[model samples]
Target: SMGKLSEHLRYCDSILREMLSKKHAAYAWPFYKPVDAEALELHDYHDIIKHPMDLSTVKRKMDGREYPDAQGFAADVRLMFSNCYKYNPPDHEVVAMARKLQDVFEMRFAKMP
Candidate 1:
């Protein structure tokens, strides 16, 4: 799924893999995590978005750490994109995506709460 720009976008998805399932949620976003940006964008966002998901610890670890839901996870991912410039330069789509993410975050968390 990255469509025509799959190669270029795949790297964007990998940012979430390094994060995995842990309290180390910060790793999910290199722009803000101080991670090696070169490592992330080397491929494409599709690869990252299609990353493997291990639900082995879904219930246990989630209960223990209160891991966010799919929407929450999306929000976290979006949050990273939003604050990317606070860490690095602003790319073309970051601002628009950040706005959408904020709206989604509010709908998922703020409105529900």
Candidate 2:
């Protein structure tokens, strides 16, 4: 249902916002000075000219059918965070935060009924 989807999307948006807020300031490499975590909501920093936002793809794909179980979902989420960490190149703290969030999501998924 759209309601469920909307609710999940809202949660995701909030989480992304929180992650960005915490990590954006401490991001390594001053060269990418003006770090924009908000862009993750609608854009993928990996390839601005070609690829679209990472969340958008997740939205389109999360029809509740792509993954047969929570582990599959966990895999996708893990992949996403891993890619983001690699591409954005955050500091050690940011990396740890990302890993922690991924673990949190995995535990949530595992406990899902």
Candidate 3:
């Protein structure tokens, strides 16, 4: 069976991992999950960000078969960025990170559904 080596994930997953890696180094670090003292003191955070999403959960959703296709994957990814924009200052550092990753995501992923 010559070149029959198969991959674990499908095409959509390929697109996801590649673009996610395009994110600026360390930019995704804070986004993996909320740190301590946030829920304790920054409790108001949850008040505004009712639909909070993150990089880690996005990939988990894909791995768990929650995403039907790339569009579904991209939707939550966009939500994660937009959430950053909504909660943080207009030109906050995190928003800048969101912008950088958003650009790469679109640049690499092609069109949506």
Which candidate gets the maximum lDDT versus the true structure?
A: 3
Task: Give lDDT per model, in order.
Answer: 0.38, 0.48, 0.69
TM-score of each: 0.32, 0.41, 0.74
User: What is candidate 3's TM-score against the reference?
Assistant: 0.74
Please list the Cα RMSD from the true structure of every candidate, rounded to 1 decimal place: 15.4, 8.5, 5.0
User: Candidate 2 clashing pairs?
Assistant: none
Where does the lowest 10-residue lDDT sum fall in candidate 1?
51-60
lDDT of 2 at 34: 31
User: Which sections of candidate 1 miss by over 4 Å?
Assistant: 1-36, 40-63, 66-82, 88-91
- Kindly report which residue stretches of model 2 are placed more than 4 angstroms away from their true locations once superposed: 1-53, 90-97
Q: Is candidate 1 or candidate 3 better by lDDT?
A: 3
Q: Name the lDDT value of residue 14 in candidate 1.
A: 35
> Residues 81-104, candidate 1, lDDT per residue (tens digit)?
544434334654555444443454
